[PDB]
Amino acid sequence: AIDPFTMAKDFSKTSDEDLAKMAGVVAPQDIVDYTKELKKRMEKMPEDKRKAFHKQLHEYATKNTDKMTVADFEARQKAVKEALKKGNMEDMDDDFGLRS
Amino acid sequence: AIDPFTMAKDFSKTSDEDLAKMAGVVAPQDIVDYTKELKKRMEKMPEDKRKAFHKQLHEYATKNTDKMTVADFEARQKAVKEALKKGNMEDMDDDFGLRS
Numbered sequence A, B: 001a002i003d004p005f006t007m008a009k010d011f012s013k014t015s016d017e018d019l020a021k022m023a024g025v026v027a028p029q030d031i032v033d034y035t036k037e038l039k040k041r042m043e044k045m046p047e048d049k050r051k052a053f054h055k056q057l058h059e060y061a062t063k064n065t066d067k068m069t070v071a072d073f074e075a076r077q078k079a080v081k082e083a084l085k086k087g088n089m090e091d092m093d094d095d096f097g098l099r100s
């Protein structure tokens, strides 16, 4: 896999920065893959860096959703919860998701 | 107390209807008293009526908060959670409160 060609529809080539910046805006249909990618990255990180990264995820989720209506935010969060369930993922700790 | 005079700052004279209609808009500073009043009323109700009333509370909370921004809604919900804690009340089941 030293060939630079890629046509992958995933987050495996996205920078940590860019993964943080999309917090709260990733489509529900992509949420299981996003969450798997975040967990993959975090599992590798020293805890100081992991905590920093988690803070960024929260800050970006907050910024990215602050101006949404509650109706639109809840619709997304419900869909996210369901997608995560179907992907056999760990339940959100908080329904406001990554904001919190 | 047959004297019709009253100057009570509470929800003891508010109709069930009007208590339902204020769901999601009651100020955090009044939330413990509101919740106590709702629990008082519900404890008396037959379960069919209680379920109907609870549905109305959810419907009104939804309508009353749908167009709020997430930022403003979260600020309120956090304050509500804290007020309820301080009043030694039962934790919200859901952070979205009565919407859900």
Ligand SMILES: O=C(O)c1cccnc1
Binding pocket: A023, A024, A025, A026, A031, A035, A061, A077, A080, A092, A096, A097, A098
């Ligand atoms: O809503 C989100 O953006 C979210 C919530 C949980 C896990 N991953 C993403």
Ligand SMILES: O=C(O)c1cccnc1
Binding pocket: B023, B024, B025, B026, B031, B035, B061, B077, B080, B092, B096, B097, B098
């Ligand atoms: O946010 C509300 O309106 C609410 C939540 C829990 C209990 N009583 C009111």
